[PDB]
């Protein structure tokens, strides 16, 4: 599937949405996923969580009037979710984090 930093980043720039393998938290919950159970791959085979609002409460990403952020899990396969996320803005800035939003690197 398309679940790498570069693969998802390029698909976002190109189509302005996540690839077909992503589902929001409420979609995942509707399918049987429970936070802490690590069951995502069994209730939603081949799927990853992404598309939900990232608030940027800590102000680690640049802010701009009208700019909002969304996030998506990266390199997920099965089991417990990892700490890899792509965070992407309404104006298409794209940052990666490999430590669950402690630190970011810009890639688009
Ligand atoms: N640190 C931090 N996490 C956030 C913020 N807004 C949303 N989140 C989170 O991003 C997620 C999606 O709403 C959640 O994490 P998660 O990716 O571990 O599920 C969640 O905690 C924020 O402003 N700061």
């Amino acid at each position: 599937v398309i679940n790498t930093f570069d693969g998802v980043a390029d698909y976002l720039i190109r189509y302005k949405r996540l690839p077909n393998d992503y589902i929001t938290k409420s979609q995942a919950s509707a399918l049987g996923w429970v936070a802490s159970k690590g069951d995502l791959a069994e209730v939603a085979p081949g799927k990853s969580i992404g598309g939900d609002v990232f608030s940027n409460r800590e102000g680690r990403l640049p802010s701009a009037g009208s700019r909002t952020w969304r996030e998506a899990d990266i390199n997920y396969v099965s089991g417990f979710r990892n700490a890899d996320r792509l965070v992407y803005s309404s104006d298409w800035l794209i940052y990666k984090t490999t430590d669950h939003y402690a630190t970011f690197t810009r890639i688009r």
Side-chain angles (χ1 to χ4, degrees), residues 1-65 67-108:
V1 289
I2 297 159
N3 75 345
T4 53
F5 292 112
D6 284 296
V8 178
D10 289 338
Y11 193 102
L12 279 165
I13 297 283
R14 190 174 310 126
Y15 299 99
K16 312 284 178 243
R17 60 186 269 304
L18 294 165
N20 299 126
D21 59 294
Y22 287 87
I23 55 178
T24 59
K25 271 171 188 147
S26 72
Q27 183 68 2
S29 294
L31 301 168
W33 172 70
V34 357
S36 283
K37 269 231 257 188
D39 70 330
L40 194 74
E42 289 71 58
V43 300
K47 302 284 182 167
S48 290
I49 292 169
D52 291 288
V53 183
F54 180 77
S55 296
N56 192 38
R57 285 191 303 257
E58 308 82 352
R60 299 193 179 102
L61 291 169
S63 11
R67 175 186 295 160
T68 51
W69 298 83
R70 295 192 173 280
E71 56 70 38
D73 285 19
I74 301 286
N75 312 304
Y76 181 70
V77 169
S78 58
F80 296 114
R81 283 169 75 212
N82 64 31
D84 295 352
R85 313 276 186 274
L86 204 62
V87 180
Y88 56 99
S89 79
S90 32
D91 43 4
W92 310 104
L93 293 187
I94 298 170
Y95 292 70
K96 67 160 167 190
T97 176
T98 55
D99 54 21
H100 199 253
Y101 325 110
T103 57
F104 304 87
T105 306
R106 182 170 176 193
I107 62 162
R108 309 281 179 289

